[PDB]
Design a protein around this ligand. Structure first.
Ligand SMILES: [Ca+2]
Ligand SMILES: [Ca+2]
Ligand SMILES: [Ca+2]
Ligand SMILES: [Ca+2]
Ligand SMILES: [Ca+2]
Length: 309
């Protein structure tokens, strides 16, 4: 059923060209706030733990999270597909992690800020209620900084949740990074393509860029890119079964949230801040130098670098 069980981006983040399966993430929840997720996909069904809808007339709506788009299923599979109970499917970064599929985007792929904020807060409340470590993964954003979403991100971060979000796809000009990625309390993820330039992976032209003034210090302020990951031509799970290939910072984001789950499960006593620091240090150690604006060190195209296993 799968054309590649181990897509290029999984090999890249594992730094293993002959990787045959992934591992890790046990006990960590990845809340994928997206268009929903195909709950019966062979390669996701073993990890589905929550399924809630934030787009309806009351909220949350439990036991409802249907993907009619594909985007949410695709993102989920990059983070945590497990190969299926027959080992014949695709593997994501953290195949032992739990999936919380929170539908915050309509089937069109666009969502309302109040719904997104509600889901961010709900994920935090569920982390607190269950006593379990949770990563919010948001393959979405806007050029504008909505205060409902910002305040929700702060609330979640205060509860110990890690927030990972797409940089956006409005690049490559300076200052195109969107929100919630551009928030100080969110990890903004840039997209790499499977091309080398200047001896490293290359940032995709579409990936939104941060700002010159605050890049370079390896400390995240508002507007800074943080971590790069594979985003172009990413094969993953799809909403009506099977698989598909799509591109974007949306695809890069779950590589990072999956990596974060893998690291957190290896090191489960870490706070969210400590986990963030570990991820930042991983990225720093793999400097990205390819693509417009990319430079030696921390830069506004690729942030700190490419965090790998
Ligand atoms: Ca769990
Ligand atoms: Ca609504
Ligand atoms: Ca940020
Ligand atoms: Ca900075
Ligand atoms: Ca760099």
């Amino acid at each position: 059923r799968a054309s590649q069980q181990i897509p290029w981006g999984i090999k890249a983040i594992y730094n293993n060209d002959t990787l045959t399966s992934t591992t890790g993430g046990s006990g960590i929840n990845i809340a994928v706030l997206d268009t929903g997720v195909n709950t019966s996909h062979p390669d996701l069904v073993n990890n589905v733990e929550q399924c809630k809808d934030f787009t309806g007339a009351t909220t949350p709506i439990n036991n409802s999270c249907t993907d009619r788009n594909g985007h949410g299923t695709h993102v989920a599979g990059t983070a945590l597909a497990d190969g299926g109970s027959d080992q014949a499917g695709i593997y994501g970064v953290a195949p032992d992690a739990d999936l919380w599929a929170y539908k915050v985007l309509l089937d069109s792929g666009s969502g309302y800020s109040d719904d997104i904020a509600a889901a961010i807060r709900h994920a935090a409340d569920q982390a607190t209620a269950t006593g379990t470590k949770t990563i919010i993964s948001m393959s979405l954003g806007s050029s504008a900084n909505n205060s409902l979403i910002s305040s929700a991100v702060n609330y979640a971060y205060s509860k110990g949740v890690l927030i990972v979000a797409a940089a956006g796809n409005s690049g490559y000009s300076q200052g195109t990074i969107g929100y919630p990625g551009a928030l100080p309390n969110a990890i903004a993820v840039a997209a790499l393509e499977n091309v080398q330039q200047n001896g490293t992976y290359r940032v995709a032209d579409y990936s939104s860029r941060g700002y010159i003034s605050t890049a370079g210090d390896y400390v995240i302020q508002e507007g800074d890119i943080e971590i790069s990951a594979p985003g172009s031509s990413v094969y993953s799970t799809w909403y009506n079964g099977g698989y598909n290939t799509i591109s974007g910072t949306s695809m890069a984001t779950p590589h990072v949230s999956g990596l974060a789950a893998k690291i957190w499960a290896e090191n489960p006593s870490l706070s969210n801040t400590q986990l963030r620091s570990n991820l930042q240090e991983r990225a720093k150690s793999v400097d990205i130098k390819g693509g417009y604006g990319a430079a030696i060190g921390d830069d506004y195209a690729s942030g700190f670098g490419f965090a790998r296993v």
